[PDB]
Amino acid sequence: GMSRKKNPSVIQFEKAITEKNYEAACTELLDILNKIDTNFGDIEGIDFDYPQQLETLMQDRIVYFCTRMSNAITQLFCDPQFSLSESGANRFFVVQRWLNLIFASSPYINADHILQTYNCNPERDSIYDIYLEPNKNVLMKFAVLYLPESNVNLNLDTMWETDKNICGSLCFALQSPRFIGTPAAFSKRSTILQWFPAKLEQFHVLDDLPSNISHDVYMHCSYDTAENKHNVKKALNQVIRSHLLKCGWQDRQITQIGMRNGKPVMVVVLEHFHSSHSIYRTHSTSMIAAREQFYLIGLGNNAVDQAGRDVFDEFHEFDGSNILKKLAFLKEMCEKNDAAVLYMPSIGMDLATIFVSNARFAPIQVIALGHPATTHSEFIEYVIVEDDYVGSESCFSETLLRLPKDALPYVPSSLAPTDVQYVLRETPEVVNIGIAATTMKLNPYFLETLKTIRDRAKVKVHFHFALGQSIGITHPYVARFIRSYLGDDATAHPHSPYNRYLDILHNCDMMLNPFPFGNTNGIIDMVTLGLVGVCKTGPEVHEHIDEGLFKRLGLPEWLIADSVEDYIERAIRLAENHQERLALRRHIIENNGLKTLFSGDPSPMGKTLFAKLTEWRQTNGI
Ligand SMILES: O=c1ccn([C@@H]2O[C@H](COP(=O)(O)OP(=O)(O)O[C@H]3O[C@H](CO)[C@@H](O)[C@H](O)[C@H]3F)[C@@H](O)[C@H]2O)c(=O)[nH]1
């Protein structure tokens, strides 16, 4: 084959380690992990030999890969000759989420075997305690392999006093994975969310942290269960803001209000906007309905297809990866239009958007809930959101512009099936239960809750998990996590193409929604197949969307659960009462609630926002 760049090689990596060329070794290692990061856990285009038996057995080949990569890393890190640079460590923290999987999808589970070689204290109380010689080289080796699935004891105060920078870097790393679900991982992260924000405020800059997974940090805290999970977002905002000013940022000066073709100018900063992404399917209709009230400049990237740019009076490309340049291009774009309104429909998916959220480009800066969590940023005034999707407003630092239920009509996907065949099984022997859930939405409570349902159900149940983001080397880890709760009563399906995903669900007799962070598109998917399921509701928007959307689709209120314990009774009831279940499905199939989502009056967004530029003009003047 001919190709753009040389593939990373397990063999090169192995050579390096034999030759005790540590520099090459770290390099090959870093290049492997990066490539895996780029492919979301897929290992195609990593070079390694392997027994022919594994040619057609992908899951087995993956495990084989992870085991073999584990062993090489072991041979390397237990070398006491091996000196890790700070830069070196910093780069590893960025890809620690992938290091975790090298071990966790291997039979070895974690790298605690490597940690044990660093202990220097033969007279210690518990094996779970590693005592280190007081030099920095070995501390960084230790931190780097302090993986989510570690059983080794670490105390944050102790560590934080030893080296703020490392301790912070590791806390970043442990919030970074898209699957933080196992008791060991979820508990490491729970603790960090309570302990770290205080310590994070104290940073002036991102210079000494793994800057490149910052956005993962920001997004992922919404998947804990703590009332106050979002606190780390405040602390991070401050650091980013601080880091922005040290770069020589001047907040844009609010003077005039440029008009175009009558209407004032709205700048829309986009993260992941293709007509295929759900950010379009939800928040594109409301954006066009605001061109009658405003003039829309949309700033996205190359990736955005034609149909995506056509939702703007005009669309500009962001010029590359450099954040400061991205902000320069946005400042001049807002000065040149004395722009009135900055709208970001998603904030979190791109780091540069979080930097934007901590500066002044417009007198009315608004977000929506492409990622449904507050920002804890002072430079963000309002949040667009459908009214039936709201729990407590106290969950948000901003002010909630609560729109009617129809204000945000969804454009369906043009992969959506039209000939769908329906499967209402009467008196099935095993009630097959589907769970549409990306990996971020799995945790010990949810899996404990499913274990309980299975134990208590008076009927046989099998869980099929359709696991968005469980790709490549992620999956064996995840599948095991599920087996650890449900043994032979669950199947864990990898990330699949859409039609295949639907085939998995179409095979179920009902579905269950994860909590705390619930589903949206998964419920469209649910009714699309003519199914009913259960969900939880809660104060946070990502808890409550489910409640709302159920109601909007004309499913009854008993399928909605305030407590974990409610969830169980309802789940069981719906698995037990076959005749009830089918009656509810027959309801939904005939009363096609779905088509009502593509219905609605999309104007309210632009109106409510003009109404605020009105109120803003009159309190300040122009
Ligand atoms: O094996 C699989 C599993 C799922 N899918 C499909 O992936 C889609 C992603 O939405 P899904 O409900 O899975 O995740 P969700 O949290 O809603 O993601 C959106 O909301 C997220 C909130 O931040 C946002 O990050 C994200 O971009 C949004 F999509 C959904 O249509 C599934 O039908 C698939 O094709 N194959």
Author numbering: 0 to 621
Please, what does the article write about this entry?
Soluble HMW1C-like N-glycosyltransferases (NGTs) catalyze the glycosylation of Asn residues in proteins, a process fundamental for bacterial autoaggregation, adhesion and pathogenicity. In contrast, NGTs are two-domain enzymes that consists of an N-terminal all-α domain (AAD) and a C-terminal catalytic domain that adopts a GT-B fold, as shown for Actinobacillus pleuropneumoniae NGT (ApNGT). We focused on AaNGT, an inverting GT that catalyzes the transfer of Glc from UDP-Glc to Asn residues in the consensus sequence Asn-X-Ser/Thr. The heart-shaped structure of AaNGT, either complexed to UDP-Gal/UDP-2F-Glc or UDP-peptide, shows the N-terminal AAD domain and C-terminal GT-B fold catalytic domain, which is composed of an N- and C-Rossman fold subdomains.
We provide high-resolution crystal structures for the enzyme in complex with a poor donor substrate (UDP-Gal) and a donor mimic (UDP-2F-Glc), as well as the enzyme in complex with a peptide acceptor (FGNWTT) and UDP, together with kinetic/ITC experiments and QM/MM metadynamics simulations of the reaction mechanism. We used 500 µM concentrations of the sugar nucleotides and the peptide (saturated conditions found for UDP-Glc and the peptide), and found that the initial velocity with UDP-Gal was ~40-fold lower than that of UDP-Glc and completely inactive with either UDP-2F-Glc or UDP-5S-Glc, implying that we could potentially trap co-crystals of AaNGT complexed to UDP-Glc mimetics and the peptide. In contrast, the UDP-Gal and UDP-2F-Glc pyrophosphates are only recognized by the side chains of Lys440 and Asn520. The sugar molecules interact with the side chains of His276 and Ser277. Furthermore, the Gal moiety specifically interacts with the Gly369 backbone, while the 2F-Glc moiety interacts with the side chain of His370. The superposition of all ligands for all three structures (AaNGT/UDP, AaNGT/UDP-Gal, and AaNGT/UDP-2F-Glc) clearly shows that the sugar moieties of UDP-Gal and UDP-2F-Glc collide with Gly2-1 and Asn30. This suggests that the sugar nucleotides adopt unproductive conformations in their respective enzyme complexes, which could explain why we were unable to get a ternary complex resembling a Michaelis complex at a structural level. Furthermore, this could also explain why UDP-Gal is a poor substrate, and UDP-Glc mimetics are inhibitors of AaNGT. The interaction of the 2-OH and the β-phosphate group could explain why the enzyme cannot recognize UDP−2F-Glc in a productive manner. Diffraction was poor for crystals obtained in the presence of UDP-5S-Glc, thus precluding obtaining useful data with this sugar nucleotide. Attempts to obtain a ternary complex that resembles a Michaelis complex by combining the UDP-2F-Glc or UDP-Gal with the peptide yielded a complex without peptide (see below for an explanation).
